[model samples]
Target: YPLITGFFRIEMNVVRLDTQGKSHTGLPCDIFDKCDPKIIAFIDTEKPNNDFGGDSVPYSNYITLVDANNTPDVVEIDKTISRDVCGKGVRKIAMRVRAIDKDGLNDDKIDNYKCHITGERNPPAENEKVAQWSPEIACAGEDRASSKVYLRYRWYNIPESTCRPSSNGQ
Candidate 1:
C-alpha cells in the first residue's frame, strides 16, 4: 500500500481508445454522460505498466488526472465509493493516460476503467498530482528533484520511502 493524500482512494484507470475514428472501445464519451462529475478521470494512451509503439518505453508505475496544470483531485480514486458523486450539474473530462511499463513490471495483466469525480464539497485548490521525480525517479540524481519530497525514517521499509509535505498541506 502506498501513501495517497487528498482523495481517500486513487487508483489509475488505463485504456487505448480508437480515436483515429471507429468506435471508442476505450471510452465513447457517451459513458461520461452517466459518470459522477465529482470523480476525476485521467486518460492515457496505453497501459500504465506497458508502453506502446516506443523503443524507449515511458513506464509509469502510477498515474493521475487533474487540470491542464497538475492539481490533485478529491478522493484520489474514489476513497469510499460514497454517495453517488454525479449530481444535477457536473462536468466530466476524458483523458488518455497512456504509457509503456518498460518490461511489464508494475502490473502484469492490466485492466481498463474510469470513474466520476467524486464531489468533495470543500475541495482543495488542485485536482491531481503525479508523484514521480525526474531522470526517472528509480534512476534519478539529486539535481532533478520535485517540490514534494519523501523521507524514510528507518529501514523497516527499504526502497527508502519519502514523505510529502505540501507547502499548504500537512
Candidate 2:
C-alpha cells in the first residue's frame, strides 16, 4: 500500500518599480538567473546523538541538493522543502539561504534588493493564490542586496480523528 500525505505550497516573489535613473537605469531587478538564490534547510536536530555510540558527527540529516553532475545545487534557488510527517502539528525547521556568489550580484545591490517576503500561516486558498497584499513593495536600488527570503511551515491536525487498523480490524 502507498502512504497518504498532505500538500502545501510556499513561494517567494520580488519586483522593483522605481528603477529609473539608478545604477540599473530602467530594470525591474528580476535579472532572470543572475542572483542565483537558493534555500537550504535542516531538521533542527544535530550533535550529541549517542544512538550510534561511535566517532561520527550528525551530518547525514541535512536536505542536501545536487546537480546532474553531482555538484552542490546552488543556482536560481527560490523554492521550498516538503515532507510527510505521517501526523502533524509542528516540526522544528532550520532554514538558511545560499546567494551572492561569483556569478551573481551582491546582496546589498540597489536593484538587486533582498526579498521583503510576507508570512502567512494557512492563508485561505481560492483560485490557488494567497489572498493578502499591502502597500506594494518595490525594490529598485543598486547599493542594496537582492531579497533575502526564508519560510516557516507547520502542520495542522488531520481531518480524520482515528487511524484505521489492519484489515484484520485488530
Candidate 3:
C-alpha cells in the first residue's frame, strides 16, 4: 500500500535578494518531475516579534523550504547567508538562508547550482533534499546533512563587496 504522509506548509519574510533581484527567502516553491505542489509563499517583515522576555528568544523556525529527494521527490534552492540591511529590532543574527527543492526525481539531477554558480547565494550545497517516505516503510527517513538547512553565520559580518565579482566568487 502507498504511504499517506500528510502535506505541510511554511512561510517566511524577505530577508534578502540576489543581484539578479530574486527573493532569497520568498522565492517560488519550485517543483520538478510532477510531484506534490502544495505551497504558500508571501512576504512579511514582522521579524517574529514574540515577547519571550529573556526567557527564550522565540525563533520562528521558519522553514524557508524543504526537500526530500531520496525517493519519489524533487527540489533545490538558492540562499543568501547574511542580511546586511535587516530592519529594526533584530540583532545577534546568524544570517542564514533556508532553501530546498524536492521537485525532482532521483533518476534526474541530484543537486542544483553548478560548481561556481554565476549568481550570488548563501552556501547552496551544504544540505540535500530528503526522501519523504512513510517512516513505517522501512523508515524512509534518511539522515541528511543539516549544515545546509542552517543559517549559522553572522549577518552583519557580510562584507559589502559580496556583491562584487572577485569578492563574491572567492
Candidate 4:
C-alpha cells in the first residue's frame, strides 16, 4: 500500500445559530443585534501517538463568521496544515471545531464538533475533493445554543522525490 503523507486542509462555517437564553453579559445573544460568531479549530498532533499525552494547536486567525439572523454566510477556512507520515498504514488524526459567540465579558460556546482525519492512499473523486460531515446539529449544553456547523476536510500527498536526498554528492 502507498503511504499517505502531506497536507491537510479544513474548511468550516456556521449554518444556523439558535440561542434563546441569556449570555454571561446579562443579555440574550440577540438582545439588540445578532451575536458575533467565530470558529476555533483544534488539532491534537501529540495525542495521535498516545492517549496520555496532551498537545493541540489552535487556529482562529480569520475564521470569524458573518452575523446574520439565523442562517449565516459560508466562511471557508484558509489554513493549510502540514504533517509527515512515514509509516505504511492508515493513520487517523483527532480534530475538533467549536462555534462561539463573541462577547465583551465572556465568549459563549455554541457547539463543539469532533472529527478525525483519515490518511488514506486512495484519492477522492474529482467532485468529491472536499469531504463533509453529516448534517447534524451540535448543542454545547442545555443553556447553550443549538448550531449546525458545516465542516469539511481534505488530504493531499507530497511526493517523496521532492525531499529525497540525491544519490551523487556534489
Candidate 5:
C-alpha cells in the first residue's frame, strides 16, 4: 500500500563564502567557509525522536559534496527516505560544512548538530610564572631572544590580562 512503499527525497545546493585579513607581514590571510570542501549530510527517517513503531535510522555514510576553490560551486546530492519502513511522519535532516586553519585545526561537532571552534592550543605548562628572556616590546614571536614577546600565551579564565604582560605573565 501507499504506507508500505512511500518514500521521499531531499535535494540541496550549497555555496561557499570566503574572507581575508592582513597578517603581520604584508601578506594575505584568506579563509573560507569550507576547508576540505566536504558537506556531511544526516537524515533521520523517523519521527521527532525516531521512536515510532515504523521509525527507521540515520544514514550510515556520507559523500563528499564539492571541491575546494569551486572547481565549481558546492552542491550535494538529494537524500532518500523510505515511507514503507519509516512510516508516515516528518523526517529530519542536517548538514554542515567544516573549515580548517593554517595550523591544521578544524571545526568539531557538538550538541546534536552544532559546530565548535576549539582555536589553537598552548604550549603545555602547569602553574608557572610567565617570563621572557628578552626585554624589548614585541609581538608574538617578533624578535626572538631580544624582546619580551606579547600574546605568546593562551590564557584561561582571564581576558583583560592577556594583552601585554608586565615582564612575563604567569
Candidate 6:
C-alpha cells in the first residue's frame, strides 16, 4: 500500500554549539553567566485545520540540555516526540528544530533547522519492527554563530488490539 499509517516517532539526538555569542544583556554566553540551551521541535501536519491555524505547527516538543556544562560544545539529548499520522502516497511531512539559550529575562535565539519526509525518501521498511528514515543533520545558526542539530524519524505499526482511541485523534 502507498499509504503509510502508523505511530511516527521523532527523536532529537544531539545539538552542538560551535560558537556561541553574548546574550541580549551583553553578557557572554559562557564564562560566569554560562549558556543554558534548549531545543524545540516543530511539526507541520498534513491536516488542514488545526488549533494553531493554517500550515502552522500543530505539534511541538522541547528539551533542555542534559548533563552538560553551562556552555556546552556538544550535548546529547534523547528526547522522543511521537505523533499518530496517516500520510497518503507522496505526502510530505515537514518538521523543524530551533535552538535557544534560556535566560531569566530574554532568551538568545541560536538556530532554526528544517526538513521533510516523504514516501519516496522514507519507505516502509522494518528494522527490529520499527521503520526508519535517514538521519537528518541541520547546521548553521543565527547571527551569533553556527550550530548543529541531529534528528531521527521512525514509524511503528500499531496493532488494532493495543490501539486505544484518543479524544482529538491527532
Best prediction by lDDT: 6
Candidate 6 structure quality by residue, lDDT tens digits, 1-170: 14556643333334343434444344566566566766666544453233332234422333334323375545556565554443323255555556656665665655555555556655545432666545655544434334556666665455444443321223
Superposition TM-score, candidate 1 onto the true structure? 0.17
Candidate 1: worst-modelled 10 consecutive residues by lDDT: 149-158
Better of 1 and 3 by TM-score: 3
Question: What TM-score, over all chains together, does every model reach?
Answer: 0.17, 0.26, 0.21, 0.46, 0.27, 0.60
Indicate the residue-level lDDT of 170 in model 2: 12
Q: Ranking by lDDT, best first?
A: 6, 4, 2, 5, 3, 1
| Highest TM-score against the true fold, candidate | 6
Of candidates 3 and 2, the better by lDDT: 2
lDDT of 6 at 59: 26
lDDT of 2: 0.27
Candidate 6 minimal-lDDT segment of 10 residues: 47-56
Task: Write model 1 residue lDDT over 57-80, tens digit each, in one string.
Answer: 222322333212111211122111
For residues 38-138, could you state the per-residue lDDT of candidate 2 as single tens digits?
Answer: 22233221211222112212223333431112112223333344332233222222222222222233332222232222224433233124333233333
Instruction: Give me the displacement of residue 31 in model 5, in angstroms.
Output: 9.6
Q: TM-score for model 2?
A: 0.26
| Local distance difference test, candidate 3 | 0.22
Q: Is 4 or 5 the stronger prediction by TM-score? A: 4
lDDT score for residue 141 of model 3: 11
List the global CA lDDT of all models.
Answer: 0.21, 0.27, 0.22, 0.41, 0.24, 0.49
Q: Which ten residues in a row have the lowest lDDT in candidate 4?
A: 161-170
Error of 3 at 51 (Å): 13
Q: After superposition, how far is residue 58 of candidate 6 from its true place, in Å?
A: 7.5
Worst 10 residues of 2 by lDDT: 45-54
Relative to the true structure, candidate 5 has a C-alpha RMSD (angstroms) of 23.7
Better of 1 and 2 by lDDT: 2
Q: How many backbone clashes does candidate 1 have?
A: 37
